Amino acid sequence: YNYRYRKPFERDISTEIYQAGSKPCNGVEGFNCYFPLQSYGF
Amino acid sequence: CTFEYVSFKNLREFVFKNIDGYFKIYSKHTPINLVRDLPQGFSALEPLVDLPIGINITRFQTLL
Ligand SMILES: *[C@@H]1O[C@H](CO)[C@@H](O[C@@H]2O[C@H](CO)[C@@H](O)[C@H](O)[C@H]2NC(C)=O)[C@H](O)[C@H]1NC(C)=O
């Protein structure tokens, strides 16, 4: 679980949430409000 | 924090621009007669540096 995934030569390690809708997710987890990184099952 | 480096009469001039994580710097220096505002004439700035840092810039400030 140490390995993970989320422009040309862009890099950004930000924790800012994937909103799945226009919700007040406010950077906090919930239904339609998900953390930007996912782990590779290697 | 992934990178670090070390190298009124003086009109000192610079240009700064950034492209796909590269960051380019050019300059010129001259003594002048009038100090108040940009004196009429012509000269070209010449390159100094390019840094491959990757940052996504939108703002800046002078360090007085
Ligand atoms: C600078 O920041 C912006 C976000 O403010 C980055 O935008 C992303 O660009 C990619 C293009 O491959 C899109 O797929 C993403 O959806 C964009 N993000 C968002 C939140 O819209 C941009 O890539 C950054 N540029 C650099 C060179 O780092």
Curated annotation (Swiss-Prot), chain B:
Domain of life: Viruses
Annotated consequence of substituting residue 44 to V: In strain: 20A.EU1
Residues listed as glycosylation sites in the UniProt record: 56
Consequence the record notes for mutating residue 35 to G: In strain: Omicron/BA.2, Omicron/BA.2.12.1, Omicron/BA.2.75, Omicron/BA.4, Omicron/BA.5, Omicron/BQ.1.1
Effect seen on changing residue 12 to S: In strain: Gamma/P.1
Effect the entry attributes to changing residue 12 to K: Partial loss of biliverdin affinity
Subunit structure: Binds to host ACE2. RBD also interacts with the N-linked glycan on 'Asn-90' of ACE2. Cleavage of S generates a polybasic C-terminal sequence on S1 that binds to host Neuropilin-1 (NRP1) and Neuropilin-2 (NRP2) receptors. Interacts with host integrin alpha-5/beta-1 (ITGA5:ITGB1) and with ACE2 in complex with integrin alpha-5/beta-1 (ITGA5:ITGB1). May interact via cytoplasmic c-terminus with M protein. May interact (via N-terminus) with host bilirubin and biliverdin, thereby preventing antibody binding to the SARS-CoV-2 spike NTD via an allosteric mechanism.
Functional description taken from the UniProt entry: Attaches the virion to the cell membrane by interacting with host receptor, initiating the infection. The major receptor is host ACE2. When S2/S2' has been cleaved, binding to the receptor triggers direct fusion at the cell membrane. When S2/S2' has not been cleaved, binding to the receptor results in internalization of the virus by endocytosis using host TFRC and GRM2 and leading to fusion of the virion membrane with the host endosomal membrane. Alternatively, may use NRP1/NRP2 and integrin as entry receptors.
Protein name: Spike protein S1
Protein source organism: Severe acute respiratory syndrome coronavirus 2
Gene from which this protein is expressed: S
